[PDB]
Request: fold
Amino acid sequence: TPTMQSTSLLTEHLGYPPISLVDDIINAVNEIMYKCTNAMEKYLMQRNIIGKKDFSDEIKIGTAKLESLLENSVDKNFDKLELYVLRNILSIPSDL
Amino acid sequence: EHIRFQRLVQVCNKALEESIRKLQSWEKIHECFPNYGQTREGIENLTVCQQQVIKLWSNLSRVEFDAIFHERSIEEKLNQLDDLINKARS
Reply:
């Protein structure tokens, strides 16, 4: 269970603070998330007219709603990932 | 005997698949674009759009996560931590 002692030792072993790995992961997935919502709006806007109606409006608000849903899923799931990793992977048992 | 790097690869992959769940549901993608759905070809565009976005999500996360794991030598470091832990309990 975490202390400055165990984390400092794991830092010496890794070459970096444990949380820098989790940060890289989370920072990477958040960049990918916004690439995906950006590609979705770009794909649909290219195809914003069908028949005779112009859906340019519904597309931008609709993609903004899906991005908010992904932000919440990403936030929920990788908060769990952060906990698990720091408890079961980047951690030293009580043997010390 | 080595389990930690495998836990890491598995939960990372798990977390990624769980995060795009509500993007795989054709019902959520049908209510963010209600009118665009009712159209015949708007359906065809939406369904190909989610396929391509899910693809982009999987391929980029794949490559970027493995790059991180190599940069930080995390597999070696976690293997050595498994060895040290197993050695302590011997």
